[model samples]
Target: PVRRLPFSTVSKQDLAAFERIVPGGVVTDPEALQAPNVDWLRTLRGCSKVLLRPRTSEEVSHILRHCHERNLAVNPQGGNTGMVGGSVPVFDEIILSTARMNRVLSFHSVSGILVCQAGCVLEELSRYVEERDFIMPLDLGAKGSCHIGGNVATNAGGLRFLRYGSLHGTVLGLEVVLADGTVLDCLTSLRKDNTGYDLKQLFIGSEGTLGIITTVSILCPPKPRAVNVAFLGCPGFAEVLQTFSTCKGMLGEILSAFEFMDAVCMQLVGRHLHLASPVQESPFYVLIETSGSNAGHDAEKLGHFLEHALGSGLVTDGTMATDQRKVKMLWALRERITEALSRDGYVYKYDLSLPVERLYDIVTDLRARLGPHAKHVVGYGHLGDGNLHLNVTAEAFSPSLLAALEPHVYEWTAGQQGSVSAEHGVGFRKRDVLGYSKPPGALQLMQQLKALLDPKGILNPYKTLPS
Candidate 1:
């Protein structure tokens, strides 16, 4: 078992040092300080006595260095919007949030590379690059709330990935503050620098257990002169898969995104958010998108593909949008499913990747297993990448429901050779289930890394992978 910080041993003098760096940024008021200590899930283990918003990497390092010297536990938080409990720590742990460290450092409009402080929100980043006719390569449900640092920490898979790729590709370099307050400044926009081990990867999906990310440099892509969307209905999962293959083969480089939503999800949004669609009851719905330089040519190609699919039975019904407003509205329908679930009740969201076919079964099998108990178990996700968001909603948290689902779904995923975590890092919610996706040797290596980087294991313990 791993060790936890002894909060009782944190002396007055030790606390004074933290206050010296950022007095007002260091929060302790019970009323004003309640939210930062706990997670977004509203599942509070206890309250943190101190939560500090460091203004710079050196200040962040100073705080961590002092905590490390005293063997104190610390949690790195950003935006406080992670679905899993990675941003918050357990009892006696001090929190270091990046909310105050946001600032855009540099950018190259011609090169389409962006360099910014970690705490910048995704929406602001989107707006920043859009003005220069480029955009960040990542987009997600939490774009308005999630920080760029948190996104990199979890290696978040967003809508733009089908075209632009993950952080591993768009992200050029990272400036990280290690567990013992060692500042690693590797922020460079160079596309290809074969300098041995490519250390930025170590922090990309580490979920802040390995380090605190201070700044990020990402290779942004030019905003398309034409961005068009097609909302199509499929008869079966096979057709949905076929449509994706057809788009990828015919459209080639032009096909940027292909996402799917089931009837349950469509109907849920319809009932909850008052979303109106012409074709509602399809077994499967796919959102197809393309971005290119010529608006007229892009529209022509998109139209031809839809006509061909509709005539050949690959699609039963569909709609297309050249206007930016309608295109985004179609995307909103897919992205708002998580928020809709939150409104229903307690949510246990699973980000899984499997054989695209298994998506059909995972929901059906789980629904059968949860029969008459689960308030609603809906499925919808990024079809192009095989990532599925299998969400189970209930009126409230139920221990019995979890016991029925956790091992059951995890072992089943192992059977299909699917990943337990597709994008959402293990965090605290899904830590124990990692054995299904990773081997004991892999687990041992992770432990070795944790022991080395965080020798005292004071940095966001009980996250990412199990010990």
Candidate 2:
């Protein structure tokens, strides 16, 4: 059991001090603080009494400095769209939100380098760059609400990951504020910087444990002139693998995304969300996207790949689209699985990165193991990246259901040398499970770094690290 650390509670003087710093940003009204206290999934709730909205990095610096001296715990939040409970406070810690800091600092058209404040919404940035014939290197279902700052803090990997790669590769620089209010500005837009130490990488996925990310400098890719999406039904997982092999062989450079979902997922979407599947229902379905400079060339290549797949008996049926409307509709079937699962019942969500060949086997094994206790057990994720989003649904939350999943899932993932939390950081709920994926020496080094950066442990306490 993790108990609350010994920290000072918010007091009159502390509130006065905060008000002096951010005059109109101090939020103490119960109604105003309610939403920030709860996470996006609504699975975890906090009792934070004060929420501070700082507009600038300096404001955040002053706020943290005061909290550090007062020994008051602070929870740095962005869009609060995180799957884990890292965005919300665990107890009555003061919530430091970056919502008001949304801004775009600069952009270089020739280099496609974008420098922006942390709180800028991902979708808004997409729109901002798309106007310039450039695209943000990442895209996600929660792009509309997720903050780029939070995305960088979590090192988010989404739909474009297959093409753009991880933030460690695309994010050229970052502007982070340490726990003691020291602004570490390494916001360089250079593609190649072989300095002594690349300090920005440390805070890229630190989950706000060591510092708070205030600004980001990321490399954006030029928008593809031609884009196409293909949704296909596979007879089995093996067939899906073969289709992927064919896709890579044919559409190598143009291949942007490869995603897969089980039939159970399709049923859930149809039954709960009234979304119809475009292809014939099969055991598995794969969504492939291609983006290139020439529409004619890309389409011809995709057609050839699809023909080979169908003729080879790998894909039973399929549908292809080039228009924006149809492409979005195709994406909704895969992106909205999380929403559909919520409507079904209680959800036990697990994000894992495993060997591509053995990805779907866990879902099959768990369906049989859980038997009828589980309403549904489905698998879906970025096939090209070997990341799986495995979910188990039931009538409601049950201790027995949870007990059946915990050690079993972690042990299974460890046995296969897979990650328990793929893109999602080890937040409050998954902090203890870090040991399952990391060794003792690595864990100890992580702890040492945390202590060195946050000597008072005032930055986002009770998260990322186990108690």
Candidate 3:
């Protein structure tokens, strides 16, 4: 239902201009452009023929300047690992890749602050800081390939969110290039700065619709001396809730993450990925992670908590791991659910934020509603953050399945006053559903801001904002 805008198509002259701006960065080879044209999920595809890689912010500014003058749409991409259809182009919009911008600008060991280019891979950054006895505030399954720029652009809330909090608070500063080639330098590494209106905040979660993020200054926390992971099987959802309450009451400050998954999700991972479940087969599973400074104290606390849960019959069976190899094996059962889902079939992914008590209700309801129409209806996500990843898989993409899921899911979420899109921004696939979450006044204000920043609407056409 998306229509192409009245933007100018890429011409030979435009390619020349881009090549002049960033020599050896212009990509017109159709074979090479195929991958960047499709999204991470392989759900959306574009017809874009050009992919531009800029090494410096100056080069990005020049490319945008020329694109703006010609009214050509631009799609700013970083790693192309977005869950939603945000990174890839919709039509023939030029792809501006940040892969070439990967570089570490600075890292203050005493302050635990990192300043890096937007294209730096998330896993690489984690290694860089971990070597210095620090850890990045955000950690995602796509950390191996996702870029920090895209993480900030979408305000990605990943595994470490429950402990480190959102990027809005951890990100100290950002340097962005506006649509008309104006460089907005607000890259300050200070912990406290009460200036006038916080300009950088507007661009943090804008999804490349306002400007392109070039550099980031983020605050990292000291690495925990001790880390423990406990994967447990619960009798039911109620016990899962009780176990979470018990976990918080006992493992308070040391608790880093609390993730949950349904039995269907467990089956998918086990069947497709051949990952055997660590605990007994239960209806629900929870992965609890704790990090603290004292190894003995943390382990004792975790031991007592697990003992209580098992003794009280809240948890059926469980396994605890403190060693690095076993801990990673346990984490894989939860982190690789998406990959397993892909191997299963076509997936209809929905990331929603709801009340903690009602998080799993939608998944249960959808199973009954979709019945045999869906191959699988699985739910899993960060329970500590109240974010639920509701996925429905089918043999292939079906219009009937799409029709059944659309307004029903959005309406159910709106009824609970839940967010339609939690961690994933309102990319092309979910743009129309924004109204289910935001008020009319807020949408109007967002439109006003978009017009103010990119009047020509040349930056990432048909994305985030509804047409």
For model 2, the stretches where C-alpha displacement exceeds 4 angstroms are none
lDDT of each: 0.85, 0.93, 0.94
Candidate 1 clash pair list: none
| Residues 1-467 of candidate 3: C-alpha lDDT, one tens digit per residue | 77888998898989899989999999999999999999999988989999999999999999999998999999999989898899999999999999999999999999999999999999999999999999999899999999999999999998989999999999999999999999999999989899877788998899999999999999999999999999999989999999999999999999999999999999999999899998999999999999999999999999899999999999999999999999999999999998999998999999999999999999889888887889999999998899999999999999988898988999999999999999988888888889899998899999999999999999888879866
Model 1 C-alpha lDDT per residue in residues 160-254, reported as the tens digit of each score: 78998889888999999998999998887788888788988989999998899999999988898988888988999889988888788767788
Which residue pairs overlap in candidate 2's backbone?
A: none
How well is each residue in 1-467 modelled by candidate 2, as lDDT tens digits?
67898999999999999999999999999998889999877888899999999999999999999998899999999889899899999899999988898999999999999999999999999999999999999999889899999999999999989999999999999989888889999998899999779999999899999998999999999999999999999999999999988999999999999999999999999998899999988999999999999999999999899889999999999999999999999999998998899898888989998999999989988988897889999999998999999999998889988998989999999998999999988888899898789998999999999999998898888988877
**Worst lDDT 10-window in candidate 1:** 1-10
List RMSD in Å for every model shown. 1.8, 0.9, 0.8
Question: Candidate 1, residue 392: CA error in Å?
Answer: 1.5
- Scanning candidate 2 in windows of ten residues, the lowest lDDT window is 458-467
Candidate achieving the largest lDDT: 3
